[PDB]
């Protein structure tokens, strides 16, 4: 109960909530039912609309009217935006010239430059370029300050998960909002887009940058808008509390625009209707500007134009419809649409069979247009897992297709022609930003980068300091004219140990064989010093990787590979090799097919064995350096130690092979030479980080040796591919993949066809930053190079696509 007759005179719009039954008069008290009985008379006011005209000029102040004409309005702070373009012969300021803003110039009082948040949901980044003529006031912005060709929201690709990210620079399996809808069976309840739930605050995790703000004793406006708001008195009520007084002033402040999105779904993403939501978006923008012209701060606010998601084309004819491939419908739960989520109905029915549900939709029709996953072997890109609100089966949708229960669901709700909620690096999702003010560069174009970086550089914006977040702080540092943060690299916890031969072949029982006692000072000496570190300046091209928890490793040398060999998980954490343009793809001889060596400098008591390997059935192994790109025969020994070996299933052996064989030297080719950094992952909690030994959950059967989760490879070379990976001046370029260990390759459904077919676009799939894997290992890579560290940094958030242009 609200007793809603208190008065909102001089409360329009206040920037504090009241304690209830007490009325309020902030700005989400629509929302709540709980406005006082004059809010919409006195703070909504709408009398003559939002422009002045030449007759107003001057008028007689009239306080029932939306905004001002009269001589007084400037001081008051409400004239209309473009008062002084009618009334005092100035410009707007889309009109004027652009002029760097080397320094803040701003009013009297103001302790930094404001921050301005400007969010527009469902724009797609090519509006940018597609929708240019329409949009003056937003292409000023975009070629005057810093722009980005787009910006990668994060999955799901709905509007409450994207929000909450920029607001926290966190994964929504670390916020909580994974989806537009959700049930927490911890709380037993359910949040909906639309309803009262969604207020409550055990949904929102994390820390929103208006809370970071506050604690700091930053004041901040209102992010969210109550829906009946229009957008000409969000952008009015912006402009008034700019113009109180220093004390009491916001220094960040948000507005949102349900357009484009809004068209969107029922036009399609280029639909012909399109156009005049993006003009009326681009007339908002210029109503800002002119309005932070006159109040003289438009070169003292810092600006932000950015997007939650894209927009694709969907209609209803491309639904997929679970009852064409379950007999059991009615024992589920769908989340549906442009991802799916499954739960049983019933927790009381112990026959409901995650099992039987995944392979029941698993490769069943011809063209499928989804595909089903336990939730931990989603791609490790998506972060999607580590959240009880997050079912254990996901479908990851085809983009352009929907996923629903049954047909009467889709016709008892065709009407839309667009939507958006796609795995996050399909080209139709992606959106923008532009940064404009004191702060950004001047004409400056940076390349694309994931919103979770956008937090941090807002509390950079306003000398915050930032909760603990996902983004990787500095990594955009070169958005930034000052205010940049400057990180250091983090301290290497555990040395490495340096073995050298101690230990003799015959103390070694491993049951391992190898052909290889077939028998000179010149390479004698030879080989001393490669087993010693001669070549490593070749095969560790940036350093060691650094070792950032406590733990005991070896530092092993080779002629053709370096490793980092852990006697706790008895395999290396990381395999450093580099292969030429030029190098030679050999074979496995004959003789050495089943060889396995034991390794002199690292004792039997930790290193794996060849009959754990043979008493288990299911699980074969592979080696992490590959004997097929061995430099010389005699170095092709040094590939079979059991130092190189790793765990693998047969299945994902069909994989790893076509990688080393094949895949690495295409690579070297076109890339002129590539170092590959390659190394087990365990991650069975599926948190996104290193599991410690404690939390494995296999084994190799009767060992202690433990079975990864997923194998990473790092592959470098030099970005100006007319240098040599191993010879390179300037700056690199990386891709890397984290391909999940499984025992079947259900995942790919053409499979049983020639690796050549299946196996590129399976690892295109599970494409990962530098820093996806750092998080997943502990490991710090790129410790040595010639490059400025927010470079580096900005090199391990890179993550190639494979989407075209
Ligand atoms: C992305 O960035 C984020 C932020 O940096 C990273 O997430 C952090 O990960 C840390 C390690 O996993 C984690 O640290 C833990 O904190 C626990 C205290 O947690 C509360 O306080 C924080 C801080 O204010 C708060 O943010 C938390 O909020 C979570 O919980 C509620 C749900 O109830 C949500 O509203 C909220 O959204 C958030 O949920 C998310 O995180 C939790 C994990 O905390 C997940 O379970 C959810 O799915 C969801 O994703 C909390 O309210 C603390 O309890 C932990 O301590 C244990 O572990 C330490 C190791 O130091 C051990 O020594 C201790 O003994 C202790 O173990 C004891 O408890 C165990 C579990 O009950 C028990 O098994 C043992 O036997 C012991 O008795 C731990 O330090 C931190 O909370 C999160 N922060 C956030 C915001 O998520 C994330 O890792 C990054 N991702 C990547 C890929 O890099
Ligand atoms: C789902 O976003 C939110 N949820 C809860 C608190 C705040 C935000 C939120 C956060 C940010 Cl950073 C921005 C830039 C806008 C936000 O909300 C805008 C909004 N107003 N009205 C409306 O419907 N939306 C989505
Ligand atoms: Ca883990
Ligand atoms: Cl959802
Ligand atoms: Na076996
Ligand atoms: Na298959
Ligand atoms: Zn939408």
Redesign the pocket.
Known sequence: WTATSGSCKGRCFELQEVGPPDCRCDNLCKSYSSCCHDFDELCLKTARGWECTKDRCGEVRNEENACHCSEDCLSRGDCCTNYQVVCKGESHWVDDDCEEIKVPECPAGFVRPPLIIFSVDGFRASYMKKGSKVMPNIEKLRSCGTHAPYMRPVYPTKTFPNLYTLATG??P????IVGNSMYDPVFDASFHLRGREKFNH?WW??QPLWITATKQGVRAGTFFWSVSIPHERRILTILQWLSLPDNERPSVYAFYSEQPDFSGHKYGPFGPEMTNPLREIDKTVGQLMDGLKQLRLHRCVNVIFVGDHGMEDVTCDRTEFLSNYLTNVDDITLVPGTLGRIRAKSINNSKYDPKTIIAALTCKKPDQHFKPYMKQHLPKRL?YA???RIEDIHLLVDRRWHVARKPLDVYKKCFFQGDHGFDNKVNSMQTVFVGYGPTFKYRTKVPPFENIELYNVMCDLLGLKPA???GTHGSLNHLLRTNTFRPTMPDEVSRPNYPGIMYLQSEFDLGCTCDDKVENKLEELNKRLHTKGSTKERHLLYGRPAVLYRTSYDILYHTDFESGYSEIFLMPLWTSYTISKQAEVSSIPEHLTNCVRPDVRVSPGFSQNCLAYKNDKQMSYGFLFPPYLSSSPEAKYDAFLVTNMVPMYPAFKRVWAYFQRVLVKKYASERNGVNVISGPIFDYNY???RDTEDEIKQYVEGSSIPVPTHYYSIITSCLDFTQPADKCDGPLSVSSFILPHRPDNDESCNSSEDESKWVEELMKMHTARVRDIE?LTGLDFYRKTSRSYSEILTLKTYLHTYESE
């Open positions: 966190l994964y399996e670390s916020h909580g055990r995790g994390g972060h580590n959240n009880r603990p977040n996902n948190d996104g980080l998080h």
